[PDB]
Amino acid sequence: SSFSRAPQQWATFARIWYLLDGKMQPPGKLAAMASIRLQGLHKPVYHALSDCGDHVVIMNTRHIAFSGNKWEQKVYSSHTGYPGGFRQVTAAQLHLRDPVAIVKLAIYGMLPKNLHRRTMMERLHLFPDEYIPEDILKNLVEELPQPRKIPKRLDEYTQEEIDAFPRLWTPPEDYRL
Amino acid sequence: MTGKELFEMWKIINPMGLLVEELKKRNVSAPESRLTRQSGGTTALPLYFVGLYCDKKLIAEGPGETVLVAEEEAARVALRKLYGFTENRRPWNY
Amino acid sequence: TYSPLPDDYNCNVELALTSDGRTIVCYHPSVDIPYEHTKPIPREEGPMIEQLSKMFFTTKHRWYPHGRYHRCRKNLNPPKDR
Amino acid sequence: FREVVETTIIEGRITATPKESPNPPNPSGQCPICRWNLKHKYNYDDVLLLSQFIRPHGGMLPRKITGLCQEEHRKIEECVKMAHRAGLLPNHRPRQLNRYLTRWAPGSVKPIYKKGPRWNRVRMPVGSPLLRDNVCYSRTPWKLYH
Amino acid sequence: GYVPKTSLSSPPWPEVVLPDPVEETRHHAEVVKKVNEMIVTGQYGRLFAVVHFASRQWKVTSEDLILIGNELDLACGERIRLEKVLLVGADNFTLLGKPLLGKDLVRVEATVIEKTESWPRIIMRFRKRKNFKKKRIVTTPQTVLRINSIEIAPCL
RNA sequence: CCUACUUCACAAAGCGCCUUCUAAAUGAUAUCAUCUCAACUUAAUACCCACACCCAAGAACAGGGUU
Numbered sequence A: 001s002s003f004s005r006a007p008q009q010w011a012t013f014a015r016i017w018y019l020l021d022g023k024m025q026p027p028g029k030l031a032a033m034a035s036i037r038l039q040g041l042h043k044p045v046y047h048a049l050s051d052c053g054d055h056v057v058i059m060n061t062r063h064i065a066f067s068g069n070k071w072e073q074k075v076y077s078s079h080t081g082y083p084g085g086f087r088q089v090t091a092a093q094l095h096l097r098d099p100v101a102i103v104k105l106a107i108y109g110m111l112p113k114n115l116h117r118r119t120m121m122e123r124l125h126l127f128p129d130e131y132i133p134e135d136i137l138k139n140l141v142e143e144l145p146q147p148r149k150i151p152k153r154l155d156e157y158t159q160e161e162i163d164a165f166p167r168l169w170t171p172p173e174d175y176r177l
Numbered sequence B: 001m002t003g004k005e006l007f008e009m010w011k012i013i014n015p016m017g018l019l020v021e022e023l024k025k026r027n028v029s030a031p032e033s034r035l036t037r038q039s040g041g042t043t044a045l046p047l048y049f050v051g052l053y054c055d056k057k058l059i060a061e062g063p064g065e066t067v068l069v070a071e072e073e074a075a076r077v078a079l080r081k082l083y084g085f086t087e088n089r090r091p092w093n094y
Numbered sequence C: 001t002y003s004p005l006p007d008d009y010n011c012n013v014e015l016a017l018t019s020d021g022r023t024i025v026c027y028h029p030s031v032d033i034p035y036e037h038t039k040p041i042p043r044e045e046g047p048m049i050e051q052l053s054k055m056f057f058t059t060k061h062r063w064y065p066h067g068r069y070h071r072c073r074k075n076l077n078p079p080k081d082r
Numbered sequence D: 001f002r003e004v005v006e007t008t009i010i011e012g013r014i015t016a017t018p019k020e021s022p023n024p025p026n027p028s029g030q031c032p033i034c035r036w037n038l039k040h041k042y043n044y045d046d047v048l049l050l051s052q053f054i055r056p057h058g059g060m061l062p063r064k065i066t067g068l069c070q071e072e073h074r075k076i077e078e079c080v081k082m083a084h085r086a087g088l089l090p091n092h093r094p095r096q097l098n099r100y101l102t103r104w105a106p107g108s109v110k111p112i113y114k115k116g117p118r119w120n121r122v123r124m125p126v127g128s129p130l131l132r133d134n135v136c137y138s139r140t141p142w143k144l145y146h
Numbered sequence E: 001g002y003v004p005k006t007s008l009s010s011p012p013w014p015e016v017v018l019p020d021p022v023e024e025t026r027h028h029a030e031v032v033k034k035v036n037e038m039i040v041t042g043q044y045g046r047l048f049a050v051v052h053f054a055s056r057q058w059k060v061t062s063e064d065l066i067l068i069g070n071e072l073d074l075a076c077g078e079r080i081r082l083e084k085v086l087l088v089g090a091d092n093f094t095l096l097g098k099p100l101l102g103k104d105l106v107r108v109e110a111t112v113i114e115k116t117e118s119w120p121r122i123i124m125r126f127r128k129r130k131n132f133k134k135k136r137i138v139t140t141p142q143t144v145l146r147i148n149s150i151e152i153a154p155c156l
Numbered sequence F: 001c002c003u004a005c006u007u008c009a010c011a012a013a014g015c016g017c018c019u020u021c022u023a024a025a026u027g028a029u030a031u032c033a034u035c036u037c038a039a040c041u042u043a044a045u046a047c048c049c050a051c052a053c054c055c056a057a058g059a060a061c062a063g064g065g066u067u
């Protein structure tokens, strides 16, 4: 409050760069957060015509994690318009071609099917590794929390965490393993 | 003067110098302009909030497209706050 | 030590009922940004449409012009408010 | 446990036998799951529970040795399968796409080239239906098919 | 009844421990006393009330305008006390009623400026192949209120 | 693509010539075994990319050349 008219208006509709680490995450659950921030549906000032989307930088999109056998079952089908040009390719093969396209297609399907969709896709910046360009690192504001809690493995439990959990059953004194 | 801001009526150039002189008259130190929030620093649409601190307590903070714009505007916010001419002032009693 | 929201970022919310239990008093002054949380102030049609697209992160379509029928339907003196 | 030390000489040496914790909170239960109030309260995430039933080269232990319930033996057997594939048991080797909740063996599943009409859609299995009766703290249950 | 700490042992949400009502009712008494001091000593700036005038809730400051979709049957110029205010906010405090505030606490005044009609407003019906085409033109009455003041009183 | 041959003859052709790149071991559930909807290990390059007059470029426009 007590700003001038023009800087208040600039402040409200200004767009914010968000960072979003996609390591060990599912691509649809990244895609939901990304899609909300790309449409501006996380702002109370939101409206469709008012054009208030943000930028979402997703890093580590080589390190996505499908749940279940979706790496081997889920199929991405496209068609070069030529006859006999129907190309179905599973999620694993497409992830070896380009490690952006799974998160990219997920988000692109989440967005509203209209003409604002591709301007919204030009606000989303996907990188497959830890490496993000410097001109984009100097824009980031908030890093969003990962939607999936990565379960730690047996190497990553500390000793007191292991010791606090009881041994459940007595093994026989003579059994081989 | 209902719905009009102070510096829509009293136009000034150089609000920073004016804020400096007014803070000398209250016997307060010169304020440090100090970048509080920013976004899109390397783009054609940045946003800055410059704050103005006096003895490491802020008196005002304002946004802008560049840093200089936001600093001048924070100076204007401070001048509205010194003079009681804020957006939240008690309305005119008719 | 209970806080219904982390009173950290916008305002310090302090709810209350009155003795009658009829009004809820909220008390919420603003949270100032600390000095420690701040940085000191640092001291042709085709390629032009690609250059603007890449600059403002939009597609190419809104940089092409539009015909007279659409330029003359536009309201040049639209209603203002506030 | 006992080991088979050899070099030609072959002997068997009982070495470093463990024991279960002294106070089961549910004594006069039957399975070691049943004795410790864990009938529906474990998943593939928690590997401190899974690792106690696993051979050191990753395989399961038989039901007679562990003395498990039949139900809980199939559940742990399934959870251990689902936890090897999520890379949560890295030290149970004999000697890269991230997964979790994988019901079937990854090298055995044909891709769905014709997902059906809306009333006959071929869905993708996620998780196992042996773990239906777990405590869901949500209102919606576990969606087992995506 | 011990369960060892697994994923599904405990519920995933963290437990909150709500404060005991002795220290909490005392704490509320402290807060209401503070805010009542702000209303006594006139610390506040301008107020906004949420007022249930007519059939809907208007968020309202002083010096503004409300267009109401019925004739109030008052003369232009008459002042009006709007009862049924159900939120009153300042910069640093609000007061919200269950569901309405006390008449002794808040007073919202408003004058009638004008009593117009609406713009002509078409009502057309049409069903195809049935020769069914009606047309009507409706103008509803309207009055404009100017909210003069939201005065607040120290009655907590 | 036109050196020959042939229809033909500042050229276009063919009948003429040129070029054309799931299976193992190991192994648990079920101490043997067992291919494992058990885990582990093992088995796209090329191409293209800056007036006027004549043209192997061409319907027009365009293109190449004009030292």
Ligand SMILES: [Zn+2]
Pocket (backbone or CB within 6 Å): D030, D031, D033, D034, D035, D039, D069, D072
């Ligand atoms: Zn049992």
